[PDB]
Amino acid sequence: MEMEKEFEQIDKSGSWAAIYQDIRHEASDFPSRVAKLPKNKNRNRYRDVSPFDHSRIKLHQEDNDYINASLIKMEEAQRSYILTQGPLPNTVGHFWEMVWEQKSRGVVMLNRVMEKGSLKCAQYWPQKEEKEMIFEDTNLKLTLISEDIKSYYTVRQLELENLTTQETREILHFHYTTWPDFGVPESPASFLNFLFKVRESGSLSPEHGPVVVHCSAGIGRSGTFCLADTCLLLMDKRKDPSSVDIKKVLLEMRKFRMGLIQTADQLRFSYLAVIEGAKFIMGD
Numbered sequence: 702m703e704m705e706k707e708f709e710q711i712d713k714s715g716s717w718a719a720i721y722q723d724i725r726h727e728a729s730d731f732p733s734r735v736a737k738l739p740k741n742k743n744r745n746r747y748r749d750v751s752p753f754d755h756s757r758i759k760l761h762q763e764d765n766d767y768i769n770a771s772l773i774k775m776e777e778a779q780r781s782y783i784l785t786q787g788p789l790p791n792t793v794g795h796f797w798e799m800v801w802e803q804k805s806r807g808v809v810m811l812n813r814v815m816e817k818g819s820l821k822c823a824q825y826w827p828q829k830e831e832k833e834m835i836f837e838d839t840n841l842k843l844t845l846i847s848e849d850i851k852s853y854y855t856v857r858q859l860e861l862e863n864l865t866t867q868e869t870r871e872i873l874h875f876h877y878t879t880w881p882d883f884g885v886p887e888s889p890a891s892f893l894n895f896l897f898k899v900r901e902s903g904s905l906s907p908e909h910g911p912v913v914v915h916c917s918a919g920i921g922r923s924g925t926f927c928l929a930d931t932c933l934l935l936m937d938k939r940k941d942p943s944s945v946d947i948k949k950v951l952l953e954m955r956k957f958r959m960g961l962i963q964t965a966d967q968l969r970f971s972y973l974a975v976i977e978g979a980k981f982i983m984g985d
């Protein structure tokens with residue numbers, strides 16, 4: 702079926718939970734043996750969220766190459782994304798090592814450091830220009846260059862230096878700051894505006910390594926971001942945009958990381974975002 706009318710048909714029939722459970726039943730199951738080794742327990746935020754072995758990002762290190770991060774490679778859309786958990790106190794150096802080694806231009810953050818009165822990820826970037834951060838375990842230096850605070854998101858320019866070679870690179874930090882502590886946003890308008898700002902920066906384009914996207918577990922809000930982006934790109938590429946099947950795209954992405962889209966409310970929000978986004982693209 703088309704998307705917008707499949708949408709109203711699920712609303713009128715109140716069957717979002719049943720649709721979402723079907724997706725969960727059909728999703729791929731692949732091994733995640735490296736994630737479950739005992740030496741990696743303090744590298745995982747949640748015991749039930751792990752990268753598959755076949756798609757995990759490897760650190761360029763001979764001691765321990767493990768990070769909780771996955772490469773989502775979308776062949777028809779010609780887009781790739783790295784989805785990862787919010788960094789932990791003992792993995793902030795690994796996180797920036799990955800950004801460096803994978804040649805990423807941008808980092809997309811969809812959570813606040815504290816939500817619901819608890820810490821959802823480490824404070825992994827510097828908050829003042831004159832107070833830079835040094836990660837001694839991976840030999841990197843990170844400096845805040847500029848910060849632009851808007852009503853729904855903040856954009857930061859960061860300098861990442863590899864202290865071993867003295868090479869430097871500019872990294873863009875796109876921080877969506879207004880996702881509610883409970884539920885999903887009422888309107889997708891500010892989330893779509895944010896996605897378009899990430900696109901306009903070049904961070905999603907083929908001349909750079911894959912964008913790094915995270916929330917707390919790296920599967921819920923993070924899944925919504927890449928699902929909406931890929932679906933809109935396919936609607937632009939195909940002769941028949943109504944052929945794009947958001948459930949099929951989501952199942953394809955779940956071949957690369959488990960659990961993408963965590964609730965039926967996030968599934969409905971993803972439909973809403975793609976539907977509204979397709980009108981603004983045109984041609985309107």
Ligand SMILES: Cn1nccc1C(=O)NCc1cccs1
Nearest residue numbers: 742743744745746747789790791
């Ligand atoms: C050390 N350890 N033993 C078992 C599990 C862990 C662990 O590091 N878990 C992740 C988190 C640490 C602190 C906040 S979340």
